[PDB]
Amino acid sequence: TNGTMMQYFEWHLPNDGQHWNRLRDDASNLRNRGITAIWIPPAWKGTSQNDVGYGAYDLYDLGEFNQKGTVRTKYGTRSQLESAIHALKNNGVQVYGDVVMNHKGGADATENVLAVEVNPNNRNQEISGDYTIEAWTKFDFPGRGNTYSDFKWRWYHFDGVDWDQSRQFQNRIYKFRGDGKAWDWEVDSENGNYDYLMYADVDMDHPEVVNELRRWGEWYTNTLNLDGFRIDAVKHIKYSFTRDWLTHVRNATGKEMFAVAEFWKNDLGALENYLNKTNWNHSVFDVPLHYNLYNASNSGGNYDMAKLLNGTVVQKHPMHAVTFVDNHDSQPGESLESFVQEWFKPLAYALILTREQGYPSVFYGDYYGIPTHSVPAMKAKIDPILEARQNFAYGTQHDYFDHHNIIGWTREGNTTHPNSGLATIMSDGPGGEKWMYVGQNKAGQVWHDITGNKPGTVTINADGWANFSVNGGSVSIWVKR
Numbered sequence: 001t002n003g004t005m006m007q008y009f010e011w012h013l014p015n016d017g018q019h020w021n022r023l024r025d026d027a028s029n030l031r032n033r034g035i036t037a038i039w040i041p042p043a044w045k046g047t048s049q050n051d052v053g054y055g056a057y058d059l060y061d062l063g064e065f066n067q068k069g070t071v072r073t074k075y076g077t078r079s080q081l082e083s084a085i086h087a088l089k090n091n092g093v094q095v096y097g098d099v100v101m102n103h104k105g106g107a108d109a110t111e112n113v114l115a116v117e118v119n120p121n122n123r124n125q126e127i128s129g130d131y132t133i134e135a136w137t138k139f140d141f142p143g144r145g146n147t148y149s150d151f152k153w154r155w156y157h158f159d160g161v162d163w164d165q166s167r168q169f170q171n172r173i174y175k176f177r178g179d180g181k182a183w184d185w186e187v188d189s190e191n192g193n194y195d196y197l198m199y200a201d202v203d204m205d206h207p208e209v210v211n212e213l214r215r216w217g218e219w220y221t222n223t224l225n226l227d228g229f230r231i232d233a234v235k236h237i238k239y240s241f242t243r244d245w246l247t248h249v250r251n252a253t254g255k256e257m258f259a260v261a262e263f264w265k266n267d268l269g270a271l272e273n274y275l276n277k278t279n280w281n282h283s284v285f286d287v288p289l290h291y292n293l294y295n296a297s298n299s300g301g302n303y304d305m306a307k308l309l310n311g312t313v314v315q316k317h318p319m320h321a322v323t324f325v326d327n328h329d330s331q332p333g334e335s336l337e338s339f340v341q342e343w344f345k346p347l348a349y350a351l352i353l354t355r356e357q358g359y360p361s362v363f364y365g366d367y368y369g370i371p372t373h374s375v376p377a378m379k380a381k382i383d384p385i386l387e388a389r390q391n392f393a394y395g396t397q398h399d400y401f402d403h404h405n406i407i408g409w410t411r412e413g414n415t416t417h418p419n420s421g422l423a424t425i426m427s428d429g430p431g432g433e434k435w436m437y438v439g440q441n442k443a444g445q446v447w448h449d450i451t452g453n454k455p456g457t458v459t460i461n462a463d464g465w466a467n468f469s470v471n472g473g474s475v476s477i478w479v480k481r
């Protein structure tokens with residue numbers, strides 16, 4: 001049976017503490033639609049209640065302690081969370097937790113730290129003398145105390161910050177001085193060294209820190225009974241740390257712990273290097289495909305549809321790609337805003353959901369909408385495609401990426417899924433038809449478009465071929481009627 005994950009959040013969900021409850025209540029519907037894993041937002045305390053979670057204040061406060069002005073996180077309390085996970089797991093849906101280990105924000109107090117400024121465009125170039133800054137690096141977790149963990153964070157657990165509370169300059173990155181203090185390596189080499197992203201950057205060279213994060217990772221998996229992770233900001237975290245943290249957590253828990261890293265670069269070579277340095281022990285989001293889809297959707301029909309998978313992880317390394325159309329960073333108004341145009345979204349979902357390559361992810365924003373921007377729910381258009389994935393997308397695949405507008409693939413179906421088999425055909429331009437082979441054994445069958453976009457039927461010829469059709473700027477997915 002086909003695996004499908006859903007990112008069950010968007011950036012602009014309301015701060016009403018009701019999200020875990022909504023997820024609990026949707027667990028049954030999600031399973032019905034063929035969702036098999038749910039990626040949940042950061043469950044811990046961020047820098048305030050309305051923090052999406054990536055502010056990472058206290059990884060041991062899952063909406064449990066009164067900290068940063070709130071007991072609950074944005075999404076709800078710890079018990080509402082456990083009860084969502086229970087409901088998901090009772091519906092046979094796995095839960096992947098987001099993991100933010102790059103930095104900590106929202107420190108309880110500042111420390112006077114000797115530091116040097118480096119060039120934000122080349123973090124290896126020091127551009128000041130050493131001097132003392134006031135850095136937000138002291139974490140004492142007053143509201144939690146030592147419950148679950150007595151680890152306290154101090155300046156020497158971090159490599160730098162971008163904010164001197166005493167001087168308050170923007171566009172500064174401060175590297176901490178101290179014995180053995182250096183930006184972590186290997187990380188992405190954009191800006192010379194991209195270890196520093198925001199807030200207080202965690203020093204992955206620090207043995208106390210490595211041990212703490214490993215232990216936290218076990219605690220988090222154990223406390224929530226997680227099935228895997230989405231690892232945030234991996235281009236900024238020492239690659240060997242991530243590789244080994246994941247191996248540690250899997251070994252400690254005896255669980256598979258499927259993991260997908262967000263390595264946000266539109267560059268297969270960088271992704272492949274990350275995969276090499278992490279020994280292929282986890283998957284990456286297919287950021288290149290995302291940009292291919294985004295660009296195609298903006299190309300008014302003129303994208304060469306035959307090249308849609310070019311340069312992508314899913315083309316090259318299908319077993320290590322999590323494919324996605326959009327996410328909470330690419331949604332409108334966000335940091336990596338590159339939102340696939342609505343008309344193209346169904347074609348994009350069909351590409352990720354009906355092909356045998358990649359582990360596809362459905363975005364909450366797409367499925368349910370983003371009311372704050374004017375993004376309607378596309379559930380009605382995604383549902384037929386999820387249905388295709390769940391019941392029909394099985395067996396040998398034949399691709400037809402051979403025209404600049406109309407492309408397609410078929411799936412021969414297989415014995416373990418009765419009536420499985422499909423032919424997906426799409427056009428970013430005028431409609432048209434394509435002959436495609438669905439399997440000799442399907443000769444004589446009458447197929448219909450499960451999306452309903454093309455009325456009518458197609459009968460498979462004696463040889464297992466048919467002339468499948470699609471409307472302009474549309475996808476049709478033909479399956480045995």
Ligand SMILES: [C]=C1O[C](O[C]2[C]([C][O])O[C](O[C]3[C]([C][O])O[C]([O])[C]([O])[C]3[O])[C]([O])[C]2[O])[C]([O])[C]([O])[C]1[N][C]1[C]=C([C]=O)/C(=O/[C]2O[C]([C][O])[C](O[C]3O[C]([C][O])[C](O[C]4O[C]([C][O])[C](O[C]5OC(=[C])[C]([N][C]6[C]=C([C]=O)C(=O)[C]([O])[C]6[O])[C]([O])[C]5[O])[C]([O])[C]4[O])[C]([O])[C]3[O])[C]([O])[C]2[O])[C]([O])[C]1[O]
Pocket residue numbers: 054055104105106107108109136161162163190197198199200232233234235262264265266267328329334335336
């Ligand atoms: C998103 C992303 O990012 C990145 O990426 C990148 C990009 C963008 O940039 O770019 C590029 O890419 C490219 C593209 C684009 O254009 O294109 C293409 O084509 C290409 O190819 C590509 O490549 C690059 O490359 C890249 O890389 C990264 O990488 C990624 O990964 C990402 N994503 C992810 C991640 C993350 C993490 O985080 C996330 O994110 C998000 O979220 C965040 C967080 O939230 C955000 O952030 C923002 O915001 C923030 C907040 O604000 C910031 O921070 C800052 O600020 C602050 C302040 O405000 C600070 O802090 C400090 O200080 C303070 C003051 C303190 N506090 C205190 C005080 C008080 C009063 O008095 C109290 O209340 C308290 O308590 C105390 O404590 C603190 O503590 C301190 O610490 C800091 O420092 C700073 O930093 C930041 O910065 C910003 O940024 C963002 O935006 C978002 O998006 C995400 O989601 C994920 O998924």
Ligand SMILES: OC[C@H]1O[C@H](O[C@H]2[C@H](O)[C@@H](O)[C@@H](O)O[C@@H]2CO)[C@H](O)[C@@H](O)[C@@H]1O
Pocket residue numbers: 298299300301343428429430431472473474
């Ligand atoms: O809907 C039929 C129509 O769909 C596609 O057109 C897109 C256009 O390419 C985009 O630029 C967008 O702005 O809107 C249209 C969909 O509303 C096909 O590209 C076009 O050939 C086809 O006739």
Ligand SMILES: [Ca+2]
Pocket residue numbers: 159181182183184203204205206
């Ligand atoms: Ca370091």
Ligand SMILES: [Ca+2]
Pocket residue numbers: 102184194195196197201202236237238
């Ligand atoms: Ca870092």
Ligand SMILES: [Ca+2]
Pocket residue numbers: 301302303304305404405428429
């Ligand atoms: Ca085209």
Ligand code: NA
Pocket residue numbers: 158159183184195201202203204
């Ligand atoms: Na670091």
